[PDB]
Scaffold this active site. Sequence first.
Site, PDB file in Angstrom:
ATOM      1  N   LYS A  53       5.047   1.748  26.744  1.00  6.79           N
ATOM      2  CA  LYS A  53       5.703   2.710  27.637  1.00  6.79           C
ATOM      3  C   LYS A  53       6.364   2.012  28.830  1.00  6.79           C
ATOM      4  O   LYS A  53       7.381   2.476  29.321  1.00  6.79           O
ATOM      5  CB  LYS A  53       4.718   3.776  28.127  1.00  6.79           C
ATOM      6  CG  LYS A  53       4.231   4.758  27.046  1.00  6.79           C
ATOM      7  CD  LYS A  53       3.392   5.871  27.686  1.00  6.79           C
ATOM      8  CE  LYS A  53       3.000   6.978  26.714  1.00  6.79           C
ATOM      9  NZ  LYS A  53       2.149   6.430  25.643  1.00  6.79           N
ATOM     10  N   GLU A  78       6.207  13.912  33.538  1.00  7.17           N
ATOM     11  CA  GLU A  78       5.163  14.672  32.877  1.00  7.17           C
ATOM     12  C   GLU A  78       4.151  13.693  32.282  1.00  7.17           C
ATOM     13  O   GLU A  78       4.491  12.558  31.970  1.00  7.17           O
ATOM     14  CB  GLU A  78       5.746  15.539  31.741  1.00  7.17           C
ATOM     15  CG  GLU A  78       5.945  14.802  30.408  1.00  7.17           C
ATOM     16  CD  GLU A  78       7.042  13.746  30.347  1.00  7.17           C
ATOM     17  OE1 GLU A  78       7.890  13.696  31.273  1.00  7.17           O
ATOM     18  OE2 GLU A  78       7.080  12.989  29.345  1.00  7.17           O
ATOM     19  N   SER A 131       1.231  -0.770  19.480  1.00  8.89           N
ATOM     20  CA  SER A 131       1.896  -0.140  20.601  1.00  8.89           C
ATOM     21  C   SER A 131       1.043  -0.242  21.864  1.00  8.89           C
ATOM     22  O   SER A 131       1.608  -0.197  22.946  1.00  8.89           O
ATOM     23  CB  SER A 131       2.297   1.296  20.233  1.00  8.89           C
ATOM     24  OG  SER A 131       1.175   2.049  19.765  1.00  8.89           O
TER      25      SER A 131
HETATM   26  O1  LIG Z   1       6.320  13.712  24.608  1.00  8.42           O
HETATM   27  C1  LIG Z   1       6.700  13.861  25.778  1.00  8.42           C
HETATM   28  N1  LIG Z   1       6.121  13.237  26.791  1.00  8.42           N
HETATM   29  C2  LIG Z   1       5.160  12.169  26.579  1.00  8.42           C
HETATM   30  C3  LIG Z   1       4.159  12.115  27.698  1.00  8.42           C
HETATM   31  O2  LIG Z   1       3.320  10.972  27.371  1.00  8.42           O
HETATM   32  P1  LIG Z   1       1.716  11.063  27.573  1.00  8.42           P
HETATM   33  O3  LIG Z   1       1.400  10.905  29.026  1.00  8.42           O
HETATM   34  O4  LIG Z   1       1.162   9.887  26.762  1.00  8.42           O
HETATM   35  O5  LIG Z   1       1.291  12.411  27.000  1.00  8.42           O
HETATM   36  C4  LIG Z   1       7.878  14.732  26.107  1.00  8.42           C
HETATM   37  C5  LIG Z   1       8.189  15.193  27.384  1.00  8.42           C
HETATM   38  C6  LIG Z   1       9.286  16.014  27.587  1.00  8.42           C
HETATM   39  C7  LIG Z   1      10.098  16.360  26.510  1.00  8.42           C
HETATM   40  O6  LIG Z   1      11.267  17.155  26.645  1.00  8.42           O
HETATM   41  C8  LIG Z   1      11.362  18.041  27.625  1.00  8.42           C
HETATM   42  F1  LIG Z   1      11.523  17.467  28.793  1.00  8.42           F
HETATM   43  F2  LIG Z   1      12.418  18.797  27.423  1.00  8.42           F
HETATM   44  F3  LIG Z   1      10.322  18.838  27.718  1.00  8.42           F
HETATM   45  C9  LIG Z   1       9.813  15.887  25.246  1.00  8.42           C
HETATM   46  C10 LIG Z   1       8.713  15.079  25.052  1.00  8.42           C
HETATM   47  C1  LIG Z   2       2.288   6.867  24.437  1.00  7.92           C
HETATM   48  C2  LIG Z   2       1.818   6.063  23.303  1.00  7.92           C
HETATM   49  C3  LIG Z   2       2.171   6.301  21.962  1.00  7.92           C
HETATM   50  C4  LIG Z   2       2.899   7.530  21.483  1.00  7.92           C
HETATM   51  O1  LIG Z   2       4.202   7.762  22.069  1.00  7.92           O
HETATM   52  P1  LIG Z   2       5.525   7.366  21.264  1.00  7.92           P
HETATM   53  O2  LIG Z   2       6.632   7.898  22.147  1.00  7.92           O
HETATM   54  O3  LIG Z   2       5.470   8.112  19.915  1.00  7.92           O
HETATM   55  O4  LIG Z   2       5.591   5.882  21.061  1.00  7.92           O
HETATM   56  C5  LIG Z   2       1.722   5.426  21.020  1.00  7.92           C
HETATM   57  N1  LIG Z   2       0.973   4.333  21.277  1.00  7.92           N
HETATM   58  C6  LIG Z   2       0.604   4.098  22.528  1.00  7.92           C
HETATM   59  C7  LIG Z   2      -0.258   2.908  22.819  1.00  7.92           C
HETATM   60  C8  LIG Z   2       1.025   4.939  23.553  1.00  7.92           C
HETATM   61  O5  LIG Z   2       0.657   4.638  24.814  1.00  7.92           O
END
Ligand SMILES: O=C(NCCOP(=O)(O)O)c1ccc(OC(F)(F)F)cc1
Ligand SMILES: *Cc1c(COP(=O)(O)O)cnc(C)c1O
EC number: 4.2.1.20
Lengths: 394, 257
Positions: free
Chosen positions: A86, A108, A376
């Site tokens: 990330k 978010e 990842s």
């Molecule tokens: O998947 C998303 N965020 C990942 C957050 O990562 P984590 O903290 O690992 O859950 C994510 C966030 C926003 C999104 O579109 C919109 F803004 F329109 F809502 C689509 C996907």
């Molecule tokens: C956030 C995360 C993912 C999943 O998010 P992607 O956008 O699908 O890559 C996968 N692996 C790790 C270690 C993460 O931190």
Amino acid sequence: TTLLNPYFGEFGGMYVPQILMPALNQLEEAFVSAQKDPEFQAQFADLLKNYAGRPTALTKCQNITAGTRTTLYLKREDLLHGGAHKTNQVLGQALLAKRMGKSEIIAETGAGQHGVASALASALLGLKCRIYMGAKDVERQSPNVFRMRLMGAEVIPVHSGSATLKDACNEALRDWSGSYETAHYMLGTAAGPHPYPTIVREFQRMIGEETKAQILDKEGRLPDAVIACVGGGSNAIGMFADFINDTSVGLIGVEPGGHGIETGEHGAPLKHGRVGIYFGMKAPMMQTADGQIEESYSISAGLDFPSVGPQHAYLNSIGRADYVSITDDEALEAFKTLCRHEGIIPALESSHALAHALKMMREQPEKEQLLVVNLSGRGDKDIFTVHDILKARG
Amino acid sequence: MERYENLFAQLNDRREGAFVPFVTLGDPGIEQSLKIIDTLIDAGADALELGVPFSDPLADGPTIQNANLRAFAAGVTPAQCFEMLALIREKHPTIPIGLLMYANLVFNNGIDAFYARCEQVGVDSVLVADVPVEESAPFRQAALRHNIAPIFICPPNADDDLLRQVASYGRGYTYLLSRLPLHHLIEKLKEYHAAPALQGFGISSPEQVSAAVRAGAAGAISGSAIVKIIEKNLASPKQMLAELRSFVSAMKAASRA
Ligand SMILES: O=C(NCCOP(=O)(O)O)c1ccc(OC(F)(F)F)cc1
Ligand SMILES: *Cc1c(COP(=O)(O)O)cnc(C)c1O
Ligand SMILES: O=C(NCCOP(=O)(O)O)c1ccc(OC(F)(F)F)cc1
Ligand SMILES: O=C(NCCOP(=O)(O)O)c1ccc(OC(F)(F)F)cc1
Ligand SMILES: [Cl-]
Ligand SMILES: [Cl-]
Ligand SMILES: [Cl-]
Ligand code: NA
């Protein structure tokens, strides 16, 4: 009007309220400009090298593949600063924020991982960061909340709706709609409205570029396949992008199968959901029969985004990439295997990709194949989850 | 049908603005919601804007988010909302009825089929909150094929290109966001032969209705203020209707010449 195509075939688009379109158009322009700007590229390269630790290693796993015709490499995004891939894209998006004259970041987070990545990038670049997080997630993710606060971010618990990831996404967008003159919305995956799927891919593509160079150096050829877990699609598209035009190279995306696809308790919308319009895009969704948005389930909270990036849905539809699923138990066995046989503790997210490679090997052990798993992230964060499950099952 | 056109012609002849309440269908339950809607009409609503409960109402503030949650707690589904819509139209033949939808609910079982259902129940317009004009083509086309007006938001900072698109693409009314001088936007929309403007967002008091009309808008939409009355009076259904009646009456009075 846009500068770039907002769709990947039928998937993608910009399905946001009218008031947000100027924010997306501004971001697209700034990105297009940045990509042509050698100074921006140099600044990004400097952060990636000297702060984040790129390039990351490509590790051969002889112990796991002994007695088979599989050669397995891991691309070690677990060794990136912050412990997951990330970090790459949040540094790029933070530079885009500064390019647009913005001093504030909105992000978010579900179970806190993107929140931490956003906070670390903001701290380094001197940006004021506020993070929306579902109240349910706040309560359950003390370590990540604490990390964000230590890094100077404001963590804002979200009590609306079901108080989880999608609600945090909603609140971040509402904020941005009013504040976009001064604040950039740092979206956490390769999904959402254009231009985010494009930006996030391009700010993760060094994963695949480095992997290509490293495998040419070590093996003198391209991989037979590169394998990556898919929650929202960022680490996978980052591994895949540079190989898309290498038609011999398999691109395998692994969604979480949860308790099993047939249980309905899974997080595999690309292969087992239904196309819908939400999160600013047309993409496969987890949704009820009448179109209410539902949740993904996985042992790994990081894979719980209930949709998937539109470029993955497109690459699937044309047959360029193949998508599979791995269950909680399969991921757990891969986690244990890597710890014991290579001394690497993988994220449970990454464990899904490894599990699929292990099946590729075990099902056909005399098949010659050169495989790269995108590792990842690291899995220190997961040891409590893993401990609890192993102890409960005796 | 021609319900908005007939309404605006009638209001114009009376030198009068439109007052248009918004509520969520099925908040706080189906029975009470139908009574609320009849009360809004009896108190002088010129048209209605009605929301279908949706899991993720991005474009809605806290009051309406809470309305959505109440409707879900009562088990309200889109199918039940369409049953309600048919009943409302059966009671009230001329009042324009607009829906405020999210894209997924329109797309879910087919865009064309969605608009056909709207036509069957006698809806007049649909505003899809998360479909900007740029993405609107299949929605506008399906709407017009089924005698439904597609409604677009005009932001108050809209550039000239956006004003021209909203003027060309919208029908029934133009939704002029409260949050350039509004009277100037109103003048440009008229120049471009747009559907009549209704001002919406943050309209909670009679003076704001009068101000909208004075600025040259055809009328005003109020939601949060109406829904807050529902939220405040959940424990007292009878008082809820009395207060809704008083509020709507006051707001409508502010629109009259
Ligand atoms: O998947 C998303 N965020 C990942 C957050 O990562 P984590 O903290 O690992 O859950 C994510 C966030 C926003 C999104 O579109 C919109 F803004 F329109 F809502 C689509 C996907
Ligand atoms: C956030 C995360 C993912 C999943 O998010 P992607 O956008 O699908 O890559 C996968 N692996 C790790 C270690 C993460 O931190
Ligand atoms: O202020 C807003 N809503 C007030 C009017 O809606 P409601 O409060 O439900 O009547 C509002 C906030 C954000 C918005 O855009 C986006 F969704 F993208 F964030 C659109 C409208
Ligand atoms: O009419 C609406 N709400 C009621 C009027 O606003 P308020 O009186 O402030 O609740 C209303 C209209 C559009 C909308 O979404 C979007 F802007 F994106 F199109 C959300 C709410
Ligand atoms: Cl090269
Ligand atoms: Cl044990
Ligand atoms: Cl036009
Ligand atoms: Na997903």
